[PDB]
Amino acid sequence: DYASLRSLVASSGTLEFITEGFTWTGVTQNGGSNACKRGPGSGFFSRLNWL
């Protein structure tokens, strides 16, 4: 449902992202990949956390 998401974000008019304190116990946070090279080396979706 890519069309429905693109419309509601467009009607919102704000990409404001408030980071919250999620307690991920027992899993490794902040995974990176080769295709998502950000800056020097591997990077991540800025608003997503890979467990």
Partner: protein
């Protein structure tokens, strides 16, 4: 002396014209029953934006 009197036929001719269009404007109002929803509760996207 001085008198005043109205002409019935000319006044009636004007009233017959206006009453004719007054009927033309309020005649047979559309009758609609089960339609679509127009006020919505939460975001839905593609279908909601079209509704």
């Amino acid at each position: 002396g001085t008198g005043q009197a109205a002409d019935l036929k000319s006044t009636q001719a004007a009233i017959d014209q206006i009453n004719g269009k007054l009927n033309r404007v309020i005649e047979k109002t559309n009758e609609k029953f089960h339609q679509i929803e127009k006020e919505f509760s939460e975001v839905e996207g593609r279908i909601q934006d079209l509704e």
